[PDB]
Design a protein around this ligand. Structure first.
Ligand SMILES: Nc1ncnc2c1ncn2[C@@H]1O[C@H](COP(=O)(O)O)[C@@H](O)[C@H]1O
Ligand SMILES: [Zn+2]
Lengths: 77, 313, 159, 531
C-alpha cells in the first residue's frame, strides 16, 4: 500500500491509495471518474515521463507520498 | 460597481476568468514601462489590453536602421523618431479607455518623485546598475518592481513585490497569503559557498548564469550582443563567462560553450512568450489575486522550458 | 453531419459486421441522403417483436443518430413513429441504461447489442425510471389494458 | 534577422496557413509576420464582436461586424506592407479546401476553438502530408503540439469528446444539476421556435390546454377517451403557434401542467425530492457586482420569461416565411428566455437560482480567455514551426503551460512527441492510388465496374466519398445504391482533388482513390491511373 498524490494544472491536490503490484490503469480510470473528464484527454506523467496503462509503481520506483502530474488538453482559444 | 456597460461587454472574457473585483483593481493601477523594444512592445500591448488605468511608455532612444523593419507598434518609415512617440498611436488604439502616455526622458535622470505616481514599474533592456537603482527606489516607496529581457532563444523575468498580500482560490474559497520578496542586489548576488547553496546550485538552471554573463556584457560594452559582430561578441561572451563564473567560485563547465549560438538578437516568438509571462505577473501583482511566481522566471526557446526560481533569500 | 475519422471508421466496420451476420428479422441500414447516397451517421433500424410476447408480429421502426463523439458517446435512438411504452418518451426517444454514457454505455458495445437491448426492454420494461406517465399509469394500474394496447399497437405495425 | 540563412530562405520562400483568426490567431499572425514569413494564408468564418477586443488586438471597436480575416490582413498590412496575406472569409470545413489546397502549404497552424474543425484540419493535413501544429488555450492554461504523418501522434490517436452529452430522460424527467435545467431551457427554445428535432422536444406532447391531473384515479375515463398514441399527441410547438405564443398559457403548460405530469410517475420520486409546480397567479400575487450577476426572485424571472416570449414571438412574426429561430447566446431575447426558463426550472426542482452571468457562461460554453496566454501559446507555435522548417522535427516537443510552477519548478513543461498509434485507423498507412478522369463525363456504374471492379481487382467493393460526413456512393448490397448508377460523378460533389475510399468485403482490403479532373484524355479511354 503506497500513497500517491495527483495534482492537476490548477494544483488540484487529490490523494490516492494504490497497491505495489497493481497496474496504474486503475488509478487513471479512478481519477477520470472522480474529476468527471475522460482519461483520454488527461495525460499522466511521472518525472516528465508519460505513464502507460501497463506500467506499475515498482517499474517507476515510486515511494510513499509521491507526486503525479496530470495535464488536461484544452480545446479553445 | 463602477464598471460601465461597455467596459463589462469588452472585458467579459477576462472578467469570467479573474473576477470583477480584480478587474476593478486593474482599472485603478498605473504602470511605468521602460524600453519600448519588442519585449516592451509585447508587455505594453498585453497590459493595455488587460485594461490598466494608464501606461507610461518611457524610451529615450530613437528608431535606428539596425532595428527590425516590422515592429507591430512603429509604422514603417518612422526611422529617426522616438520609440515611445512612434508606438503611442498604436498603443492607444489598442484600448481607447486606457490612458497611454509617452516619456522621452532618460530613466537615469528621473527623480525619485517621478516613480511615486506608479504602482508598478517594469524595466526592459536596462543596465544592471539602473536595475538596482530603480529597484531600490521602488522598494523604498512600496512600488511593485519588474524587469525582463530577451536574448536569442532565451528570456528572463524578475519581480520584486516586497511584502505581497494576495487572495488565492482554496483547493477545497478566498484565502489570504503573504509572500516576501528580495531586491535585485540579493537575487543577482546570491552566495554559493554553503552546502545548501551547493545543493541549490546543483538544482539551479544554468539560465541564471547566462543572465549574469549577459548583464556583465551589457555593463561592459554598453549594448546587447549583435549578429553583425558575432565573432568578437562571442569571444567576449566566452571570456566574460569564464571571469564571471570564476569570480563566484563556480566551474564554467555548467554553462555550455555553445551558449553563444542562442543568445544573439531579439526574436518575435521569444518576445511574445516572455512578454506574456511578465504581463501576467504584473496583472497578478496589481490585482492582488493568485500567487505570483518566485522572483525569477527563465525561458529556453530551443528546449521549451520555463523555469521559476527563488534566488536571494 | 461532419463526423470524426474514428467515428466514421467505427461506423463502417459496424455496418460491415451487421451485414456479415445479424439476427433474423432485425433491420439496420444507414438512411438515404436526398442526393442519392446513404448516410453512415443516420441509420433507419427496425426491431421485430419477440415471439410469445404481446409485441409479437410487429416491426417497430427505430432511428439511430450518431454524433462525432461516437463511440465515446452513445447513439440517440428514437422510435419513428413513437410507440406506447413506459420507457419511451412521447417524443419517441427511448430511455435505456445502456444508451447513456454515465450509466451503462461502453464504447466497445455494438449496434447489435443495443438493438437487442431495445428489443428486450420492449418485451419487459422497468418501472423505477418511467418516461411516459400514461403508459406507466396504465401499466401500474391494470396490466390487462396495457397488454390490449400493446397488442393493438403491434397489429398496427405488422409488416 | 537572427535566423540562420538556410532557415531564413525557408521561411521567406515558404507558404504557411493559419486557420482561425482569433486571439491566438491574431498573435500567431503577428509573430509570423515579425519573424519573416511573407506568404501567409488566413481563414476564419466569424465576425468581430465587442467581446473579442479583450484578446484580439488586430481588431478595434470600429471593426465590429466586419470579417475577422480581412480586418486581420488589413491590420497586419498597416505596420508591414510587404506581407502577402491572403484572407478567406469561410469555414475550413468547406469542400473547396481539399487536399490540393492543403498541399501548397509547408506548414499548417491550428488556431481553432472546437474539436470538429480540429479533427477536419488534422485529417486534411494527414492526407496532404503537411506538418501541422496543434494548440489550445483555456484561461491560464494551454498547450502546443506537433502532428506529422508517420512520425508523431495525430489528433485522433487518442480520441477526445467534442461536446458533453446528457441523458435523454435526465434532462426532461429528473434534473439534478443547474446545467440540466439550462440545457432543458435551450432545448425548449429550440422546440418552441427552432427547427424540428425530436431529441430537443423536452416538453411532453399531449392534450395541452386543459390543466389535468390524477390520471391514476380517472384511468378508466382516460383510456376510454384516448386510443393508442393518445390522439396522436398534439404537438407542443403547433399548440403554442395556434394559441399565439401567449406567455400565460405557455407558463402554465411548461411550469405547472408539465410538472404535474412529472408527478404522475410517483415511482421515480421515491428517492428524490419531487418537483413543485408553479402557478402563474400565485407567483404574480406573492409580491454589488454587475447587473447580470444579480440573482432575481421567481416573480422577476417569470416576468422576464413573459417579456422574452413576447419579443421572440414578434421576431418570429417579422421573420420571412416563418423561418425558425436559431439560439444565440449574444441575442438578448434568446438569452433572456433561456435564463428565465432555466431559473424557473431550477426553482421548481428546489435548486439555487443562477444569475444571467452564470447562465450565459454555462449555456454558451464560454471559455475564459486573456491576451497573455494566447501570446505565449502563439510564441510557442512559431518556435515549433521554426524547429520544423529547419529539419529539427526530432527536437519538437509537446509544451504545456501551467498556471503555477510544478514541484519540478517548471512553468512550461515540454514532453517528447509520442510515436503514432498503430491502431489509429486515421493516420495508418493505406494504399493511395490516384486516377485522372473526366468528372463530368463518367458515371457511378463506370466508376464501380470499369475502374474499381476490374482495374483494382475488387470483387464486392463499396465506395465512400470521404468528405468527412461519412456518405457512401456505392454499396456492395445488390439492392441499395443502384438508383444512382447512371448518375454522373459530378452530381455527387466529386471534383478535382476529391478522394473516395473503397473497401472490399471478400477481399478484405481497402484503397484510397484520388480524383483528378482532365478534359483532354482522348476518346479511347475515359480514365487513366497516375503512377
Ligand atoms: N472551421 C471553423 N470552425 C470554428 N471556428 C473557426 C473555424 N475557422 C476559423 N474559426 C475561428 O477561429 C477562432 C478560434 O476561436 P478563439 O481561439 O476563441 O478566437 C474563432 O475566431 C473562430 O471563428
Ligand atoms: Zn493517429
Amino acid at each position: 500500500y503506497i500513497k500517491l498524490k495527483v495534482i492537476g494544472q490548477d494544483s488540484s491536490e487529490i490523494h490516492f491509495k494504490v497497491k505495489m503490484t497493481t497496474h496504474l490503469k486503475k488509478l487513471k480510470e479512478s481519477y477520470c471518474q472522480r474529476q468527471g473528464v475522460p482519461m483520454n484527454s488527461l495525460r499522466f506523467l511521472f518525472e516528465g515521463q508519460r505513464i502507460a496503462d501497463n506500467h506499475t509503481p515498482k517499474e517507476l520506483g515510486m515511494e510513499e507520498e509521491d507526486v503525479i502530474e496530470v495535464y488536461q488538453e484544452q480545446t479553445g482559444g | 460597481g463602477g464598471i460601465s456597460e461597455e467596459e463589462a461587454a469588452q472585458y467579459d472574457r477576462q472578467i469570467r476568468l479573474w473576477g470583477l473585483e480584480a478587474q476593478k483593481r486593474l482599472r485603478a493601477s498605473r504602470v511605468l514601462l521602460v524600453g519600448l523594444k519588442g519585449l516592451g512592445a509585447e508587455i505594453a500591448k498585453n497590459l493595455i489590453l488587460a485594461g490598466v488605468k494608464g501606461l507610461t511608455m518611457l524610451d529615450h532612444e530613437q528608431v535606428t536602421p539596425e532595428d527590425p523593419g516590422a515592429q507591430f507598434l512603429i509604422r514603417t518609415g518612422s526611422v529617426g523618431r522616438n520609440r515611445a512617440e512612434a508606438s503611442l498611436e498604436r498603443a492607444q488604439n489598442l484600448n481607447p479607455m486606457v490612458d497611454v502616455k509617452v516619456d522621452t526622458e532618460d530613466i537615469e535622470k528621473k527623480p525619485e518623485s517621478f516613480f511615486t505616481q506608479f504602482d508598478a514599474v517594469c524595466l526592459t533592456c536596462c543596465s544592471r546598475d539602473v536595475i538596482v537603482k530603480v529597484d531600490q527606489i521602488c522598494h523604498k516607496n512600496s512600488i511593485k518592481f519588474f524587469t525582463g529581457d530577451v536574448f536569442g532563444y532565451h528570456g528572463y523575468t524578475f519581480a520584486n513585490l516586497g511584502e505581497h498580500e494576495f487572495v488565492e482560490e482554496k483547493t477545497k474559497t478566498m484565502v489570504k497569503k503573504k509572500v516576501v520578496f528580495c531586491p535585485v542586489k540579493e537575487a543577482l548576488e546570491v552566495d554559493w559557498s554553503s552546502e545548501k547553496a551547493k545543493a541549490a546550485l546543483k538544482r539551479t538552471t544554468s539560465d541564471y548564469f547566462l543572465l549574469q554573463v549577459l548583464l556583465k556584457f551589457r555593463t561592459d560594452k554598453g549594448r546587447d550582443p549583435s549578429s553583425d559582430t558575432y565573432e568578437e561578441d562571442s569571444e567576449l561572451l566566452l571570456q566574460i563567462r569564464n571571469d564571471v563564473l570564476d569570480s563566484l567560485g563556480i566551474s564554467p563547465d555548467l554553462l555550455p560553450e555553445d551558449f553563444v549560438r542562442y543568445c544573439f538578437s531579439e526574436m518575435a516568438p521569444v518576445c511574445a512568450v516572455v512578454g506574456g509571462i511578465l504581463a501576467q505577473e504584473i496583472v497578478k501583482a496589481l490585482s492582488q489575486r493568485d500567487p505570483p511566481h518566485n522572483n525569477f522566471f527563465f525561458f529556453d526557446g530551443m528546449k521549451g522550458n520555463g523555469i521559476v526560481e527563488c534566488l536571494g533569500p | 453531419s461532419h463526423m470524426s475519422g474514428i467515428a466514421l471508421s467505427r461506423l463502417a466496420q459496424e455496418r460491415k459486421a451487421w451485414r456479415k451476420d445479424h439476427p433474423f428479422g432485425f433491420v439496420a441500414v444507414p438512411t438515404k441522403n436526398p442526393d442519392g447516397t446513404m448516410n453512415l451517421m443516420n441509420w433507419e433500424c427496425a426491431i421485430p417483436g419477440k415471439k410469445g410476447t404481446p409485441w409479437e408480429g410487429g416491426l417497430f421502426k427505430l432511428r439511430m443518430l450518431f454524433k462525432d463523439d461516437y463511440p465515446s458517446s452513445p447513439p440517440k435512438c428514437k422510435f419513428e413513429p413513437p410507440l406506447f411504452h413506459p420507457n419511451v418518451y412521447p417524443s419517441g426517444t427511448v430511455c435505456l441504461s445502456i444508451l447513456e454514457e454515465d450509466k451503462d454505455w461502453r464504447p466497445a458495445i455494438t449496434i447489435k447489442q443495443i438493438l437487442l437491448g431495445i428489443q428486450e426492454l420492449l418485451n419487459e420494461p422497468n418501472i423505477q425510471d418511467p418516461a411516459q406517465a400514461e403508459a406507466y399509469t396504465i401499466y401500474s394500474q391494470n396490466r390487462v389494458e396495457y397488454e390490449k394496447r400493446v397488442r393493438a399497437q403491434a397489429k398496427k405495425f405488422a409488416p | 534577422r537572427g535566423l540562420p540563412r538556410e532557415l531564413a530562405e525557408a521561411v521567406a520562400g515558404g507558404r504557411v496557413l493559419v486557420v482561425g483568426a482569433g486571439g491566438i490567431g491574431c498573435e500567431l499572425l503577428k509573430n509570423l509576420v515579425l519573424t519573416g514569413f511573407s506568404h501567409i494564408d488566413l481563414i476564419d468564418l466569424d465576425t468581430i464582436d465587442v467581446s473579442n477586443l479583450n484578446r484580439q488586438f488586430l481588431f478595434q471597436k470600429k471593426h465590429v461586424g466586419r470579417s475577422k480575416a480581412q480586418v486581420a490582413k488589413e491590420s497586419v498590412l498597416q505596420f508591414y506592407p510587404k506581407a502577402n496575406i491572403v484572407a478567406y472569409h469561410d469555414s475550413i470545413m468547406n469542400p473547396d479546401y481539399n487536399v490540393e489546397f492543403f498541399r501548397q502549404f509547408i506548414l499548417v497552424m491550428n488556431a481553432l476553438d472546437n474539436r470538429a474543425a480540429r479533427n477536419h484540419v488534422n485529417r486534411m493535413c494527414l492526407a496532404a502530408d503537411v506538418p501541422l501544429i496543434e494548440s489550445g488555450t483555456a484561461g491560464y492554461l494551454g498547450q502546443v503540439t506537433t502532428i506529422k504523418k508517420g512520425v508523431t501522434e495525430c489528433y485522433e490517436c487518442h480520441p477526445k469528446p467534442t461536446q458533453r452529452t446528457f441523458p435523454g430522460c435526465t434532462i426532461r424527467n429528473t434534473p439534478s444539476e443547474p446545467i440540466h435545467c439550462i440545457v432543458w431551457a435551450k432545448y425548449l427554445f429550440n422546440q418552441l421556435f427552432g427547427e424540428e428535432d425530436a431529441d430537443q422536444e423536452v416538453s411532453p406532447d399531449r392534450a395541452d390546454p386543459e390543466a389535468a391531473w390524477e390520471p391514476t384515479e380517472a384511468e378508466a375515463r382516460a383510456r376510454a377517451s384516448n386510443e393508442d398514441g393518445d390522439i396522436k399527441r398534439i404537438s407542443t410547438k403547433e399548440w403554442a403557434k395556434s394559441t399565439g405564443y401567449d406567455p400565460v398559457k405557455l407558463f402554465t403548460k411548461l411550469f405547472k401542467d408539465d410538472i404535474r405530469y412529472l408527478l404522475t410517475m410517483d415511482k421515480l420520486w421515491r428517492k428524490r425530492k419531487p418537483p413543485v409546480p408553479l402557478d402563474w397567479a400565485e407567483v404574480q400575487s406573492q409580491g454589488l457586482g454587475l447587473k447580470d450577476q444579480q440573482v432575481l426572485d421567481v416573480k422577476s424571472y417569470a416576468r422576464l420569461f413573459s417579456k422574452s416570449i413576447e419579443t421572440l414571438r414578434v421576431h418570429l412574426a417579422e421573420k420571412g416565411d416563418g423561418a425558425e429561430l436559431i439560439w444565440d447566446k449574444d441575442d438578448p431575447s434568446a438569452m433572456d428566455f433561456v435564463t428565465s426558463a432555466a431559473n424557473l426550472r431550477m426553482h421548481i426542482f428546489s435548486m439555487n437560482m443562477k444569475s444571467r452571468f452564470d447562465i450565459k457562461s454555462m449555456a454558451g460554453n464560454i471559455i475564459p480567455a486573456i491576451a497573455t496566454t494566447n501570446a505565449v501559446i502563439a510564441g510557442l507555435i512559431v518556435l515549433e514551426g521554426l524547429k520544423i522548417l529547419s529539419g529539427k522535427i526530432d527536437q519538437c516537443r509537446t509544451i504545456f503551460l501551467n498556471k503555477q510552477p510544478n514541484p519540478r519548478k517548471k512553468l512550461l513543461v515540454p514532453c517528447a512527441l509520442d510515436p503514432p498509434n498503430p491502431n489509429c485507423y486515421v493516420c495508418a498507412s493505406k494504399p493511395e492510388v490516384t486516377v485522372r478522369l473526366n468528372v463530368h463525363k463518367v458515371t457511378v456504374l463506370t466508376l464501380q465496374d470499369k475502374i474499381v471492379k476490374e482495374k483494382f481487382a475488387m470483387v464486392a467493393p463499396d465506395v465512400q466519398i470521404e468528405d468527412g460526413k461519412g456518405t457512401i456512393l456505392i454499396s456492395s448490397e445488390e439492392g441499395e445504391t443502384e438508383a444512382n448508377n447512371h448518375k454522373k460523378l459530378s452530381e455527387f460533389g466529386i471534383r478535382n482533388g476529391s478522394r473516395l475510399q473503397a473497401d472490399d468485403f471478400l477481399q478484405d482490403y481497402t484503397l484510397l482513390i484520388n480524383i483528378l479532373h482532365s478534359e483532354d484524355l482522348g476518346k479511347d479511354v475515359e480514365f487513366e491511373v497516375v503512377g
